[PDB]
Structure formats: C-alpha cells, structure tokens
C-alpha cells in the first residue's frame, strides 16, 4: 500500500554510511576493479559462447557448401557433354 | 568491586529501557568516530568485567591531581572563611602538579554520515539530527542560543 511505510517488518538490523563527499569516486577503480571484471566473466563465458561457435561454423560451412554447389557449373558435369 | 561490577553489568543491559539516552550514544559515535569523545560513558561491557582496581589507581593517580581539581561553594559562606578552612589537606595532599603529558586532548573529526538501528516492533521511533558547532569558548556560542529559543519546541501535552 503506502509504499515506504508498511512493506515488511524488520528488527535488529543496523546500517552505516557516509556523506558522499567523505569518500572518493574511484577507490582503486582501476587496480582493485580489474580482477572482479575477470573472475565473473568466466562464469558466463562457459555457458555463453558454445552456440555462437555453431552458427559461424555453419555460417562458413554452408557458405562454402553454397559456393561450390553454385559457383562451378562445369564442376561435376564438365563441358565434355 | 564485584558487587559494583555486577550492578553495572546488571544496569548495562537494563539501559536499553530509556530510548532517549540510547540514540545519543549512536549520535556521538557517528560524528566523532575515531576520537575518545565518541565512546560510551559507561564504556563497553566486557571491560567492566575485565576491569581491575590497579588501572583505576592509575587514573586515580593520573588525573585527580590539581590544577585539574577545582573547588567552589555558595551560601552564607563568604570567601576568606572558605579559604582558611580550605586550607590544608589539599593545600596539600597533592593534588600535585606534574604532567600527564599536557593537556592530553585532540580536535575531533566530524563525520558526514548516517546510522540506523532498524527495529520495527516498537510503537515509536526517535530521531536525532545535528551538525557540529563551536566549542565552549567562542563568540558565536551565544549568538546561536537564541535561534533555538526562537524556533522553540513542541510537546503533546501543552495547553498552547
């Protein structure tokens, strides 16, 4: 109903925070962040890539398969007859 | 010691009954974090158990020297007839002056921040909000005495 008032009931939690001025926009964003980028990227790339392979394969597979099938009329039947 | 060690411990837990004092403890610690000023008056509990009367004797000896000590009185007493019967204990019993370094203190840091203890069971929720200001000795301290008096205060129970 009333959005902030009545949602849940919660007791004996404590919270701490600072003025945004009190702290920095990039607390080692570069150094400390780069590992975090890496670690989780693999958890996905396990389950992400495998299909993308398949298309590109088939993509070229059919591409070639398409090409010679079309490209060369005197391929199987050459122009002796 | 043990008798008193217990009562305090007994009281330490009871102290959750008056919410007023409670939040102020939070209040200081959130502004003055990193300063001895930010800390519980009664101090954390476990120390009281751990507390031994030698360390007292330290602080007994440490800061109970003069000039730290100060005496006054008012009444039919005038001044002289105070000082003559001030005279000698505690002319005196020293009550000394040496050091305890000098005068050990530091300006305290001021923290833009927040603290929240969320407990939804209770019927009501206190609030406190503040900003830091000048020390005891300072011109403006009086200049701001009135702004509060002007903005005043309210309570359930007035006939106003």
From Swiss-Prot, chain A:
A GO cellular component annotation in the UniProt record: mitochondrial inner membrane
Topology feature Mitochondrial intermembrane, residues: 68-81
InterPro entries attached to this UniProt entry: Cyt_bc1_su8 (IPR004205), Cyt_bc1_su8_sf (IPR036642)
Stretches that traverse the bilayer: 39-67
Record PTM N6-acetyllysine, positions in chain: 32
GO biological process: cerebellar Purkinje cell layer development; hippocampus development; hypothalamus development; midbrain development; mitochondrial electron transport, ubiquinol to cytochrome c; pons development; pyramidal neuron development; subthalamus development
Mitochondrial matrix side stretches: 1-38
Domain of life: Eukaryota
Membrane protein topology class: Single-pass membrane protein
Function: Component of the ubiquinol-cytochrome c oxidoreductase, a multisubunit transmembrane complex that is part of the mitochondrial electron transport chain which drives oxidative phosphorylation.
Name recorded for this polypeptide: Cytochrome b-c1 complex subunit 8
Natural source organism: Bos taurus
Taxon lineage: Eukaryota, Metazoa, Chordata, Craniata, Vertebrata
UniProtKB/Swiss-Prot annotation, chain B:
PTM sites of type Phosphoserine: 52
Compartments, as annotated in UniProt: Mitochondrion inner membrane
Modified residues (N6-acetyllysine): 3, 88
Coiled coil ranges: none
Modification type N6-succinyllysine: residues: 3
Protein's job: Component of the ubiquinol-cytochrome c oxidoreductase, a multisubunit transmembrane complex that is part of the mitochondrial electron transport chain which drives oxidative phosphorylation.
Self-association and partners: Component of the ubiquinol-cytochrome c oxidoreductase (cytochrome b-c1 complex, complex III, CIII), a multisubunit enzyme composed of 11 subunits. The complex is composed of 3 respiratory subunits cytochrome b, cytochrome c1 and Rieske protein UQCRFS1, 2 core protein subunits UQCRC1/QCR1 and UQCRC2/QCR2, and 6 low-molecular weight protein subunits UQCRH/QCR6, UQCRB/QCR7, UQCRQ/QCR8, UQCR10/QCR9, UQCR11/QCR10 and subunit 9, the cleavage product of Rieske protein UQCRFS1.
Similarity comment text for this entry: Belongs to the peptidase M16 family. UQCRC1/QCR1 subfamily.
Protein name: Cytochrome b-c1 complex subunit 1, mitochondrial
Organism: Bos taurus (Bovine)
Gene name tied to this protein: UQCRC1
Segment of the intact protein contained: 161 to 320 of 480
């Amino acid at each position: 109903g009333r959005q902030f008032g009545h949602l849940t009931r919660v007791r004996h939690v404590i919270t701490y925070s600072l003025s945004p001025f009190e702290q920095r926009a990039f607390p080692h964003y570069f150094s400390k962040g780069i590992p975090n980028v890496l670690r989780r990227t693999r958890a996905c790339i396990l389950r992400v890539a495998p299909p993308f392979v398949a298309f590109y394969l088939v993509y070229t597979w059919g591409t070639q398969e398409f090409e010679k099938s079309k490209r060369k009329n005197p391929a199987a039947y050459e122009n002796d007859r | 010691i043990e008798k008193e060690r217990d009562v305090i411990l007994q009281e330490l837990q009871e102290n959750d009954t008056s919410m007023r004092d409670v939040v102020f403890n939070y209040l200081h610690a959130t502004a003055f974090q990193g300063t001895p000023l930010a800390q519980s008056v009664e101090g954390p509990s476990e120390n009281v158990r751990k507390l031994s009367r030698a360390d007292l004797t330290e602080y007994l000896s440490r800061h109970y020297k003069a000039p730290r000590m100060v005496l006054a009185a008012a009444g039919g007493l005038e001044h002289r007839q105070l000082l003559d019967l001030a005279q000698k204990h505690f002319s005196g019993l020293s009550g000394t002056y040496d050091e305890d370094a000098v005068p050990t203190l530091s300006p305290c840091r001021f923290t833009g921040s927040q603290i929240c203890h969320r407990e939804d069971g209770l019927p009501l929720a206190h609030v406190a909000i503040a900003v830091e200001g000048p020390g005891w000795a300072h011109p403006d301290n009086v200049a701001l005495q009135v702004a509060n008096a002007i903005i005043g205060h309210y309570d359930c129970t007035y006939g106003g």
